[PDB]
Amino acid sequence: MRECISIHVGQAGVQIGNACWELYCLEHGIQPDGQMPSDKTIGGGDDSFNTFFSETGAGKHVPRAVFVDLEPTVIDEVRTGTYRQLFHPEQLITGKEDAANNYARGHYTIGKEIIDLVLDRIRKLADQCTGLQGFLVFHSFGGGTGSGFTSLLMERLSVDYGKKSKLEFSIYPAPQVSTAVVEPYNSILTTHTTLEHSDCAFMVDNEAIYDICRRNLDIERPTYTNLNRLISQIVSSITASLRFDGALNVDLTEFQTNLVPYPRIHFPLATYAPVISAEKAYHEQLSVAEITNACFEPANQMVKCDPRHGKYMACCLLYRGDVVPKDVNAAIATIKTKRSIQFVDWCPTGFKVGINYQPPTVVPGGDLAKVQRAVCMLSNTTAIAEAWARLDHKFDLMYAKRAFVHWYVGEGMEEGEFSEAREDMAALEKDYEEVGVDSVEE
């Protein structure tokens, strides 16, 4: 067994962490007070679930988790809420004034005063590990803490744990729920500073989650609670192989090995099916063929984009529930003859498949229906660069006029960091294009 530490930064990181740890507890039969009746080795162990939970003599199972926010209101709701007892005070770190949606304020001004305390609390958790694999980091692109503080923390983690792996779960900004005009800036800035420090990053576009909630859950105006319960299902689908017995993606190193042949192109697209409303009176359960086919509909992706007009470098199918290999291979055979799935020349066309027989757990009273089988596809496709194209266009529109730049300069950032970050993004878009596209009045 090798442990993983989860780091949740800013409002989005913390609220998504809440939802994920709730789900994990439901999936492992851990009660809100931390007790786990089915764990028969009291006070210790090295089962698969111990990758994410440590144990006390009293039999309490404690998330290997740090929550960090630069203001207190959101972590205070963790301190006083349903899972109050799960977490130890030293794992919940707040400041008092936040980064005001300003990357430079979260990175340079307020980051500098809190980074050492955060690294010390992380070090406490790492001290209780016999063989740390590395880190799962949850945050938004758009917020001041999520962007700025996270990028500072990423650099320092590269310094203090230079051989550990680092995975990101990143909320990409969507105007339908966004809080600030400058979120394109923050996004580019944090991506620029975090790129070489991240081994694999899962982007979740709030716009895609929002439309999935409206279209398939029949929520007229989704809230962060709706969004986060759906995101937590996807995240749990991705980490289940670290937390359960199996042979696919069993450590963090394997995620890079299976999904990231080129280290800068480290943004796999997630696709999830089926999403079924719990208030849907009558539902016919979907087969292996149907849910696998739905993995190739853009409407089911975490980022809206079109993988037919790019190339695949890797593809992993993660199934939960009543699924056997023969039905998977039959569904894949059917799908490859009806869909545009092109791999880059220097990679085999194929799928890595993981099946866990326990179907998805859902939150009691949530929006998601229980289903008999579900799948999460992780594919590394150049088409995700469409999202970069969108961000970079908005950035260019504002920066050409230097709109809002003075907020960042006044925090001690130099204007040239804007064009450095933007040229790094231009290189990145160029890389995606090289890998994924060929030479192309009447």
Partner: protein, 351 residues
């Protein structure tokens, strides 16, 4: 009030479409870079498909199909036909064709001479044309072809030249047929009922393949380098009423039976082949697109596809009608306002 943006100022078709849209008084044109549009009449090169369909509160539509270039580039069309099972190498309506890259720069040069030589051996007409996606060579000797190709720097195609074309009398002269096809957001395929024959005004001559104005029916090369531009018809342009009456009088057939059946079969086959790659049926934005298919008719009244144009102009007599049709079935279908000129191409044979 619907809104639209114009990003191709050099397009006859969509200039006329913009003017009609304004004349309805229910469409407002915005600045080319304002993102809050319903409709993008886009540029021909590097159109930002990746930024479409992310505007909350706006159904967005664009007048190009992302991916349709595979049909509309010489080399990509030959690749698509040879490698697509439903078109196959056993495709009876496309002329034998091979893709060849200059020496300066896969390529098919070796396979091309494999068949060239059983036409040297076989006594067969061994004339071929070389083209790129200006710069045409017609010859019975392969090495003039290959050397002309490597003299230029871009990828070319070598295609069997159709040595026995149908020839209009009087004139003993060549032509090609241009058909206009509108594909809407639902992937209905609509053939415009008016086609045009771009005729040559020079008599055909199977002995000197180098004076290329009896061999290239392009309206440009006929409007200047030919002596008789406008003798038989205005602007080397015959339309379907006339060509039909000619087929009835000379050959005892109709345009429908002898040629149009084949043309519809070819259009539907090409577009149904690429449909899974380009359809926008479940996408966050929607596409339509206007194509020009160019056909040749040999002397046995067999139709051959020559090429597909992703950004065609119209015949000047037909703009008014065709453009109005574009607003009717492609645009107002999506954005409703406050005797169709198209034939829907559909066929469901059970087997």
């Amino acid at each position: 009030m619907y809104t639209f943006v114009v990003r191709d100022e050099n397009s006859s078709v969509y200039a006329e479409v913009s003017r009609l849209l304004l004349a309805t008084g229910q469409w407002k044109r915005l600045r080319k870079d304002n993102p809050r549009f319903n409709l993008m009449l886009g540029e021909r090169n590097r159109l930002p498909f990746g930024r479409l369909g992310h505007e909350p509160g706006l159904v967005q539509l664009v007048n190009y199909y992302r991916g349709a270039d595979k049909l509309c580039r010489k080399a990509s069309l030959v690749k698509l036909i040879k490698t697509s099972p439903e078109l196959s190498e056993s495709c009876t309506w496309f002329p034998e064709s091979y893709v060849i890259y200059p020496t300066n720069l896969t390529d098919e040069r070796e396979v091309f001479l494999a068949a060239y030589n059983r036409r040297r051996e076989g006594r067969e007409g061994n004339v071929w044309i070389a083209k790129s996606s200006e710069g045409i060579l017609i010859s019975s000797e392969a090495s003039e072809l290959l050397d002309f190709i490597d003299e230029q720097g871009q990828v070319h195609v070598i295609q069997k030249y159709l040595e026995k074309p149908l020839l209009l009398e009087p004139g003993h002269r060549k032509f090609d047929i241009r058909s206009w096809v509108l594909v809407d957001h639902l992937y209905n395929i609509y053939l415009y009922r008016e086609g045009v024959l771009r005729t040559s005004s020079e008599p055909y001559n199977s002995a000197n393949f180098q004076d290329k104005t009896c061999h290239l029916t392009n309206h440009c090369i006929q409007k200047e380098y030919s002596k008789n531009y406008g003798r038989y018809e205005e602007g080397n342009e015959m339309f379907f009423e006339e060509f039909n009456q000619y087929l009835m009088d000379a050959l005892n057939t109709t345009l429908e039976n002898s040629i149009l059946l084949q043309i519809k079969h070819i259009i539907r086959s090409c577009l149904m082949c690429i449909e899974p790659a380009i359809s926008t049926k479940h996408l966050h934005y929607q596409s339509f697109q206007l194509f020009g298919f160019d056909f040749m008719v040999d002397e046995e009244l067999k139709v051959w596809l020559i090429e597909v144009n992703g950004a065609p102009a119209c015949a000047q007599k037909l703009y008014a009608e065709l453009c109005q049709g574009i607003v009717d079935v492609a645009i107002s279908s999506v954005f409703p306002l406050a005797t169709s000129i198209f034939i829907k191409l559909h066929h469901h044979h059970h087997h």
